[PDB]
Write a protein that binds this ligand. Structure first.
Ligand SMILES: CCCCC[C@H](CC(=O)NO)C(=O)N[C@H](C(=O)N1CCC[C@H]1CO)C(C)C
Ligand SMILES: [Zn+2]
Ligand SMILES: [Zn+2]
Ligand SMILES: [Zn+2]
Ligand SMILES: [Zn+2]
Ligand SMILES: [Zn+2]
Length: 181
């Protein structure tokens, strides 16, 4: 398996609603989780593994046998919190890049589970901060789109290194560019 890095367009591509809840789905859930623990992270969205489906795995503790193992298919934010908290974020698809993004502190979420059943879970604190990072991905939103103009300028150069690496492995000009904003 592999980790799709910015600027790969898969990270931007539209993401397919999931209709079937079979064994294949559980296997892919399993793999995401195990990629999350391998890479020491607290969540992961399907596009990050090269699949454009509305799928996201999630453990608030980000440690094996700790926290919980949350699966959310076809999620949607029923609402965001009025209060905004800043906080420092990194993302797997942007190796070694860290910086601040300010977000609603809490969220009401509606998703389905791995079986088919439709639930409605409310999140705050670090879980709601992670959920939101991951759900953006589900929408093709990457955390630097959430960053201030000032925060973006610190990481401009490191984002570029990724564009150039992408250009080096593919030959194709980068399909998107931090300088564009
Ligand atoms: C909080 C926002 C959710 C982060 C998701 C990323 C992984 C990812 O790219 N999901 O798409 C992660 O685990 N990032 C970690 C991260 O941002 N963390 C880990 C614990 C604290 C918080 C940074 O303050 C590190 C390991 C880079
Ligand atoms: Zn591989
Ligand atoms: Zn496993
Ligand atoms: Zn850890
Ligand atoms: Zn991410
Ligand atoms: Zn430039």
């Amino acid at each position: 398996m592999e980790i799709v890095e910015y600027p790969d367009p898969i990270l931007r591509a539209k993401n397919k609603r999931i209709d079937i809840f079979d064994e294949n789905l559980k296997n892919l859930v399993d793999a995401m989780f195990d990629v999350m623990y391998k890479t020491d992270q607290i969540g992961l969205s399907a596009p990050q593994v090269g699949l454009n489906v509305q799928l996201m795995v999630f453990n608030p503790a980000g440690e094996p046998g700790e926290g919980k193992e949350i699966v959310l298919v076809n999620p949607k934010i029923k609402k965001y919190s009025d209060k905004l908290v800043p906080f420092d974020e990194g993302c797997l698809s942007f190796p070694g890049i860290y910086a601040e993004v300010v977000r609603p502190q809490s969220v009401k979420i509606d998703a389905r589970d791995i079986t088919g059943e439709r639930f409605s879970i409310s999140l705050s604190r670090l879980p709601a901060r992670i959920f939101q990072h991951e759900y953006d991905h589900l929408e093709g939103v990457l955390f630097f789109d959430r960053m201030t103009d000032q925060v973006l300028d610190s990481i401009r150069e490191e984002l570029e290194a990724l564009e150039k690496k992408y250009e080096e492995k593919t030959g194709l000009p980068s399909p998107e560019r931090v300088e564009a904003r």
